[PDB]
Structure formats: structure tokens, C-alpha cells
UniProtKB/TrEMBL annotation, chains A, C:
Domain of life: Eukaryota
Annotated organism of origin: Plasmodium falciparum (isolate 3D7)
Record's protein name: Translocon component PTEX150
Segment of the intact protein contained: 668 to 823 of 993
Automatic annotation (TrEMBL), chain B:
Domain of life: Eukaryota
Gene Ontology CC annotations of this record: PTEX complex; symbiont-containing vacuole membrane
Organism field: Plasmodium falciparum (isolate 3D7)
Residues of the full protein shown: 27 to 215 of 287
Disulfide-bond pairs as recorded: C87-C114
Name of the protein: Exported protein 2
Keyword Metal-binding: no
Keywords of this entry: Signal
Automatic annotation (TrEMBL), chains D, E:
Species lineage: Eukaryota, Sar, Alveolata, Apicomplexa, Aconoidasida
Annotated protein name in UniProt: Exported protein 2
Tree of life domain: Eukaryota
Length: 156, 189, 156, 32, 32
């Protein structure tokens, strides 16, 4: 009947099918840590923005659109510029080992509708209603419930 | 009345001005751009007819060295033959020596011209075209492209359009790059 | 009758002509290492991409197409730029070859339909059907079989 | 009628404008 | 008939347009 207690009983006794409509609604709302103020974020190396990106050329896009029997699509100036500046200072210590780890965490967050440095609870539309998940509590057993069982019928 | 001038000078405008714009696109893109395409296909025939006999022949061997008994695309040869023809046009304007008199000077000139002409154009090489022309220069196995079966085609009076992959005889297997690259990996591993 | 055992008998007793259609189909399919997850690749120095490459100029291509009694085809700016940076930040780090061996390995892989850093099993169309080969098991005696004997007739 | 103007001013366009473009290429690339 | 317009407006084009291009080169390179 309370938001926090039901997920402690999901492993023990009761399943997900027997919850109330007001209990499924409450378990998909965010916790009490949401609305609690915490103004601090760290590790501002996000894979969302590309530093190599540039404007639409509007002359190359005209040239690539006419199919022009060409041999290269992109501009390759800013993406060779980033390769050169990586090799200049990449040699102070170049194997920095986090290219895997900083990558697969942020990719899995983008499947949950979570931004990359976002430490809080994030919504994603499952069926007809939203489910607020985070990095910490992924609510994966609810997403299995509201996708499988809620194909034909409606729940709020 | 003054309505007839509004009837006549309007129909003078609505007929003369669209058709003057449609003929402009029929002329520039339907006549002039195919016409300019024809003469510059002719200019490789009035001049340059002696090199393209040796050029298309050295390209038929080169496609066999790049690919090596896999299905070649008949359509994007034409994209890459134009770059290979522009390599030989660029070399033969730089040589006082004749092509028939000293042929390997051109193979060192043409292959290195398209070792770089492919490198400045082809970004991704899934078939490794720049990479294989690197090793044909670096291992000097292009000396088999000028041999006693191969000097007979380049002397003969065949236009370069007549030269097919059937007219060029195949290199022996010990001469090609594929066995060279296999025998290398056997020795080094 | 099993995929793994037949290639141990190919040297000993039986040839390639006496296999079943379902045995030739099974021996050309990939092994059990395919579908097994292994997310790691190394040595990202591929000869597939050229760092010296640039866009179609569309004014030079207009000029080279008219046959123009010219003396040079390519642009030679980015390919002299790569020659200069090789002599300066490379001569400190002294010479490197990259052809004594890494070139000929990647060339032989491109004759088998394998990408350059690709450590797994790769298809190539031989006749009418596909044969999955890798760096490790080249399946060269099958390619001799399905090219020579399968000229006129059909096998799956 | 008004169809003769559509007959005349069209043939005025379809004859004067292509020939003005062909002579331009004969002059610039063949004479000049 | 409509063939006289094809006779007249063509000769109007084949005479006015080459001479307008030849005088342009006589003016710019020979006078100006």
C-alpha cells in the first residue's frame, strides 16, 4: 500500500499481476529522492555531443544529392583534426582504459531514456503510461510486466 | 478598349516566358552537357589512342591483381577506369620517351600516379585498392605486366575500346599478388 | 555427421567428393564460436581507410574531364601534408614500417572477404552459396572444391 | 480568335530561343 | 501559313545574334 514496501515483497511472496491500479501507478512514479534538491553533477565527458561536428555545407549536400558518381560523403577535415590533436597529447598517457567503460554505461542509459550524466529518475513511455527509472533502480521487472501483459488491455 | 491589351500582352507573357525557361534547361542539360560529354570522349580518341592501348591493358591486369577470381563490378570499373585514364593522360604529357620504346617507365609513372590519385579520392577501400597498388610498387611484381605475351597486345593495332579482359592473357599464379601475399604470410608466420 | 568431426577425417581417410549435401552445407556454415559473445578488438591501424583522402573538387573533375593537355591529376596537398607530418613527429618516434607484415596480412584477408581487424568468421560467395571463412580456419580446401567441381552442377 | 497569338508567339519562342543558344556555343567555342 | 514565321523569325535570329556577338568583341578588344 506504500510505494517503498511493495518492492521488498516482490521477491518474497507476491507477483506483479495482483497489484492495484493505484499501486502500479505509484510504483511507476518517482521516489522521494525526486523533489529533493541536490545540485551537483560530475564527469562531463558525454557521448551525446560530437566535437567533430559541423554545419550543413549546402554545396556538398547539393553535390551529394545528385548522386554524382562520387567517392566520399563527409567532409573529413574536422574528423582528421580531432585525430591529429589526439595523437599530440594522447602520448602523455594514451591508453586511458575508460573508452569501453564510459561507453557501455552511457549506451545502456540511452535505452532507458536517461541522459548520460543524469543521476536521477527518468521517464520512458511503456505502452500507454510513463515509467520513471534511473541508473540505480532500473525497474526492469516492471518493464517486463507493462510490455508483455499490457499489449491488449489498459493499465494506469 | 484597353482590355484587349490586357488580353494580348498577358498571353504574350504566359507563353513566351515559360517556354524560354524550359528550352534553357533542355538546352543546357539535354543538349550542351551531353554534347560536351561527346567531344571529350572523342578527345581521348584523336589524341591519346596509343597510351590507352597500353593503359586499358595495364588496368585489366590491375583489376585481376586487386580482385583475383572474384566477381568484379562491371559498373564501377567505369568510375575507376576514368581515374586510371586520367593517370595515363597525366603521365604521357610528362614523358618525351615513347610508350612502345620504354614501357616500364610508364608503369612506374602511371601506377604511382594512381597510387596517389586513388588515395586522394577513395576514402574507404574495402577492396584495398590503394593498399594493393602500394605493394605492387613496393615488391616490383609489375614487371610481369610487361612480358613477351603482353608486349604483343600493346604493339598490335587494336583500339582501346576493343581491349576486353579476354584479349589480355592471365598472369601465371606465381606472378600475381594473391600468391605473393600468401607466400609472404607463410614465410613470416 | 557432426560439423567438427569431418574436418579431422579429411586428412586421414575420406575426400571432399563423398560428403552429403547437408554435410557440405554444415561445413560452410560458421562454427560455434560464432554467436559466442566477445566484445574486444585491437590494432586499429587499418589499410581500408585513407587519411589522405578528400572530397570531389567538382572544378578539378570538370577540368580533368575535358582532357586539357594537363600534367597532374590528383590534388597533392593532403598527400604531401601526410608526408611532412611523417618526417617530423615520426622521426622523433623513429621509423616504422607497417608493411613488413601488417600489410600482407590485411591484403590476404581482403581476398577472403574479411575486414582488416575482423577476428571472426566471414562469408564469401563461391558459386551459388556462401562459405564462412576466417583468419584462423581459411577453409581453403573447400574453396578448391566448390570452385572446381561446382562449375556446371549445383550444390547447397 | 486568341488561338493565333498562342500559335504565333509560341513559334516565335521555340525558334528564336534555341537558335540563340546554339549560335552562342558556335560563336564562343567555334569562332572566339 | 505558319511556315513564313518559321522562315522570318529564324533569319531574324541567325542574323541579329551572331553580329551582336561579333560587334561585342570588335568593341571590347578593338575599340575599348
Amino acid at each position: 500500500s506504500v510505494k517503498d514496501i511493495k518492492k521488498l515483497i516482490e521477491e518474497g511472496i507476491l507477483d506483479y499481476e495482483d497489484l492495484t491500479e493505484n499501486e502500479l501507478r505509484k510504483l511507476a512514479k518517482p521516489d522521494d529522492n525526486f523533489y529533493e534538491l541536490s545540485p551537483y553533477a560530475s564527469d562531463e565527458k558525454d557521448l551525446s555531443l560530437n566535437e567533430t561536428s559541423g554545419l550543413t555545407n549546402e554545396q556538398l549536400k547539393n553535390f551529394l544529392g545528385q548522386n554524382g558518381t562520387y567517392h566520399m560523403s563527409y567532409d573529413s577535415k574536422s574528423i582528421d583534426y580531432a585525430k591529429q590533436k589526439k595523437s599530440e597529447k594522447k602520448e602523455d598517457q594514451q591508453e586511458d582504459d575508460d573508452g569501453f567503460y564510459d561507453a557501455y554505461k552511457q549506451i545502456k542509459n540511452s535505452y532507458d531514456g536517461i541522459p548520460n550524466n543524469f543521476n536521477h529518475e527518468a521517464p520512458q513511455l511503456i505502452g500507454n503510461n510513463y515509467v520513471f527509472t534511473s541508473i540505480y533502480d532500473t525497474k526492469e521487472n516492471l518493464i517486463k510486466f507493462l510490455k508483455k501483459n499490457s499489449e491488449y488491455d489498459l493499465y494506469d | 478598349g484597353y482590355g484587349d491589351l490586357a488580353a494580348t500582352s498577358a498571353l504574350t507573357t504566359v507563353i513566351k516566358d515559360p517556354i524560354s525557361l524550359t528550352i534553357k534547361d533542355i538546352y543546357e542539360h539535354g543538349v550542351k552537357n551531353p554534347f560536351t560529354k561527346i567531344i571529350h570522349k572523342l578527345k581521348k580518341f584523336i589524341r591519346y589512342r596509343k597510351v590507352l592501348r597500353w593503359s586499358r591493358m595495364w588496368w585489366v591486369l590491375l583489376v585481376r591483381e586487386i580482385v583475383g577470381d572474384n566477381t568484379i563490378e562491371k559498373k564501377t570499373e567505369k568510375a575507376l577506369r576514368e581515374i586510371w585514364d586520367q593517370c595515363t593522360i597525366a603521365v604521357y604529357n610528362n614523358t618525351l620517351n615513347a610508350v612502345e620504346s620504354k614501357p616500364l617507365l610508364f608503369l612506374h609513372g602511371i601506377l604511382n600516379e594512381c597510387r596517389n590519385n586513388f588515395a586522394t579520392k577513395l576514402r574507404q577501400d574495402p577492396s584495398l585498392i590503394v593498399a594493393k597498388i602500394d605493394q605492387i610498387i613496393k615488391s616490383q611484381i609489375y614487371r610481369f605486366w610487361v612480358s613477351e605475351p603482353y608486349l604483343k597486345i600493346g604493339r598490335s593495332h587494336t583500339l582501346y575500346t576493343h581491349i576486353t579482359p579476354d584479349a589480355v592473357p592471365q598472369l601465371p599464379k606465381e606472378c600475381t599478388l594473391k600468391h605473393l601475399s600468401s607466400y609472404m604470410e607463410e614465410k613470416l608466420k
